[PDB]
Design an enzyme around this catalytic site. Structure first.
Site, PDB file in Angstrom:
ATOM      1  CG  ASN A 132      -0.223   0.073   2.290  1.00  0.00           C
ATOM      2  OD1 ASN A 132       0.837  -0.605   2.669  1.00  0.00           O
ATOM      3  ND2 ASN A 132      -0.689   0.856   3.341  1.00  0.00           N
ATOM      4  CB  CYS A 158       2.056   3.571   5.069  1.00  0.00           C
ATOM      5  SG  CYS A 158       0.979   4.886   4.651  1.00  0.00           S
ATOM      6  CD  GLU A 163       0.786   0.344   6.753  1.00  0.00           C
ATOM      7  OE1 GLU A 163      -0.334   0.857   7.025  1.00  0.00           O
ATOM      8  OE2 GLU A 163       1.393   0.866   5.492  1.00  0.00           O
TER       9      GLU A 163
END
Ligand code: E4X
Ligand code: TTP
Ligand code: MG
Length: 656
Positions: A349, A351, A353
């Site tokens: 995604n 970010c 994570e």
């Protein structure tokens, strides 16, 4: 700043109604002053429920908890988290928290109050969109989304673009997998033409991100390094150059196969391929990827050959210039995913994570919260793992409710979340927990506590998810998953957990009832919420001893208590760019405890990530701080993380 904060909360109390149900009625009755139009700022179903239980709800709220927020955290709440009527804040933080709690729990007033207390005492926090939108009309409670290109056609590219538009509008960050789109020069049978490849397509995504705000659009673009346009991809963020070779408002990530890393290490050749010519590379991983890729090389289905090292050099140099691309290890992410029964996972995604499956039919969704790890430390300097597990269960049930409540911007997102029910519980205050326990970040004591925190989180999450499956049935695609076969995350790292928790009994409970959620844990960035709550971000080491010049509260407390505080120290810390290491008056035990991220080994940071990583079924937004970078250092760092088994080898590279 301490007095400032109190005055500002006192001012807000002066300037707002006291009674929660009153504020909820004003929000709901709101009339647009331009239109004379009735636009409720809270949902009728939520108001109904609040007015029906108004005495319990109103009398649960503890308004003194508003004074808990530090100065800048409170201003951030006033700025974006508290609902306004005609530009004047109507909600107290406590109002917003209860609005959120009722927003998630509806009729279950017992549940709402339990959540209200956890949240207002700051044991954990829901994600920003949840805090914005819970209890409002068409509530978009989820943080971010993942998608694959629908098809390698103009039709598909533009349908996917429309998805990003609609999702960005609803305030979701996005990760997009683009490797299936054919490259520069490749034949187009329908026009008798040739494609210009990725760059001009991404320039459309770039301008769509500038155009549509979150509630600028944040799209991370994922590419596998076998793609023929990989060298151009790596220039897209650079500040130099022609506008037509740039996409500077996007974010960039590599989805890296093991094979690439092996060929870089042994200095072999690397084939660049066109995906129309070499189909399905993005839909296999590991050995099956290796066989397919080598087969196309033997078939001559290759457009260009470079030294693996020349592409390696381009990657590192792009990171030296921009801090990107992000580094994900595709085979690590697929090999250690509970979602691997669905097919190959094509990206992460925004970010880095989240590791969830995406298809033409499914847009994955990130349902997020974070635990404030600082809160679980006792006055005894012991860690209350039992309490941490208990809070973690509350969060699982809350996020699980959010999946069913959420207003999805596209139907593909609804379908994905409904079939797999993934959640992402993360953390903040890891550095604070260590400081409060008196453990230096790199110490052996910190290292054990790092493992144990994340063992606890995973355990408690699994337990709540299992209870949910006993109550509701397992998620749809549960059978045939690794966990349905008795394989938990640490098993996939070949790690034996400590003796702290009884995994044998948990696995028996899971063998009997299954679980409700395909994934559970994902340490996200926490940039906003950590500042609201006054903790160091997520899993990051200590940032600085100073942030108005606000000295770190823990340090200030420790130096004050020792008799060693002198207001002069403030400027010396500033002169040392946040460091206390060369301040002669401060004792060594404190210097060790308060080393900054710039004085902490990144090798130990990566190792500690791998260590907790065995208990995190998704991934972790892992930044890397290297003051004085060079190619040997970056090379060493990436290879180390890859070989540690990390899913996300690097989020941002930070320097100074
Ligand atoms: C780049 C290098 C590195 C990062 C990760 C894994 C490694 C694996 C092997 C070799 C180097 C690796 C890093 N260099 S660094 O950024 O200049 C630095 C050194 C010491 C401290 Br304290 C803070 C920052 C490092 N951290 N620790 C260590 O030994 O090197
Ligand atoms: C038509 C056109 C396509 N493309 C790209 C978009 C896709 O990545 C790829 C194919 O587009 P498509 O829209 O699939 O073209 P097609 O179906 O006419 O031909 P084929 O059977 O060869 O698919 O070419 C351009 O980059 N520019 C153009 O002007
Ligand atoms: Mg076509």
């Amino acid at each position: 700043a301490i007095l400032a904060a109190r005055i500002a909360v006192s001012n807000l109390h002066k300037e707002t109604k006291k009674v929660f149900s009153d504020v909820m009625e004003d929000l709901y009755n709101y009339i647009n002053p331009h239109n004379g139009k009735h636009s409720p700022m809270v949902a009728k179903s939520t108001l109904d429920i609040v007015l029906a239980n108004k005495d319990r709800l109103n009398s649960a709220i503890i308004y003194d908890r508003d004074f808990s927020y530090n100065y800048f955290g409170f201003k951030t709440l006033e700025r974006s988290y508290l609902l306004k009527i005609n530009g004047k804040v109507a909600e107290r933080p406590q109002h917003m928290l209860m609005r959120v709690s009722v927003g998630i729990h509806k009729e279950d007033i017992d549940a709402a109050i339990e959540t209200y207390n956890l949240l207002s005492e700051r044991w954990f926090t829901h994600a920003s969109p949840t805090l914005f939108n819970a209890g409002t009309n068409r509530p978009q409670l989820s943080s971010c989304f993942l998608l694959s290109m629908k098809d390698d056609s103009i039709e598909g590219i533009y349908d996917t673009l429309k998805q990003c538009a609609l999702i960005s509008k609803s305030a979701g960050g996005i990760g997009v997998a683009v490797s299936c789109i054919r490259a520069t020069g490749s034949y187009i049978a329908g026009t008798n033409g040739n494609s210009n490849g990725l760059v001009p397509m991404l320039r459309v995504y770039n301008n769509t991100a500038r155009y549509v705000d979150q509630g600028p659009g944040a799209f991370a673009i994922y590419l596998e390094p076998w793609h023929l346009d990989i060298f151009e991809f790596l220039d897209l963020k650079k500040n130099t150059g022609k506008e037509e070779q740039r996409a500077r408002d996007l974010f960039f990530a590599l989805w890296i196969p093991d094979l690439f890393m092996k060929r870089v290490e042994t200095n072999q050749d690397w084939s660049l391929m066109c995906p129309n010519e070499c189909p399905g590379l993005d839909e296999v991983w590991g050995e099956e990827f290796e066989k397919l890729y080598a087969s196309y090389e033997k078939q001559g289905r290759v457009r260009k050959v470079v030294k693996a090292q020349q592409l390696w050099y381009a990657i590192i140099e792009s990171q030296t210039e921009t801090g990107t691309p992000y580094m994900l290890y595709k085979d690590s992410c697929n090999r250690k995913s509970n979602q691997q029964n669905l097919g190959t996972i094509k990206c992460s995604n925004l970010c880095t994570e989240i590791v969830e499956y995406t298809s033409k039919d499914e847009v994955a969704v990130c349902n997020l919260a974070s635990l404030a790890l600082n809160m679980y430390v006792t006055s005894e300097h012991t860690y209350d793992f039992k309490k941490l597990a208990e809070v973690t269960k509350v969060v699982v049930r809350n996020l699980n409710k959010i999946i069913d409540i959420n207003y999805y911007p596209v139907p593909e997102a609804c379908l994905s979340n409904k079939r797999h029910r993934p959640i992402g519980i993360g953390v903040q205050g890891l550095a604070d927990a260590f400081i409060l326990m008196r453990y230096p970040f790199e110490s052996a004591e910190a290292q054990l506590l790092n493992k144990q925190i994340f063992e606890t989180i995973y355990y408690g999450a699994l337990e709540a998810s299992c209870d949910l499956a006993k109550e509701q049935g397992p998620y749809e695609t549960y059978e045939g998953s690794p966990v349905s076969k008795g394989i938990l995350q640490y098993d996939m790292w070949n790690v034996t957990p400590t003796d702290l928790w009884d995994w044998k009994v948990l696995k028996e409970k899971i063998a009997k009832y299954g679980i409700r959620n395909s994934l559970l844990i994902a340490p996200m960035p926490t940039a906003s919420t950590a500042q609201i709550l006054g903790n160091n971000e997520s899993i990051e080491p200590y940032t600085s001893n100073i942030y108005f010049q606000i000295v770190n509260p823990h340090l200030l407390k420790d130096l004050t208590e020792r008799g060693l505080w002198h207001e002069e120290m403030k400027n010396q810390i500033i002169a040392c760019n946040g460091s206390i290491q060369s301040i002669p008056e401060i004792p060594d035990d404190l210097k060790q405890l308060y080393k900054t991220v710039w004085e902490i080994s990144q090798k130990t940071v990566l190792k500690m990530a791998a260590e907790r990583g065995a208990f995190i079924d998704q991934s972790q937004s892992l930044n890397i701080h290297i003051a004085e970078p060079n190619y040997g250092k970056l090379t060493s760092m990436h290879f180390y993380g890859w070989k540690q088994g990390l899913k996300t080898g690097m989020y941002y590279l930070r320097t100074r």
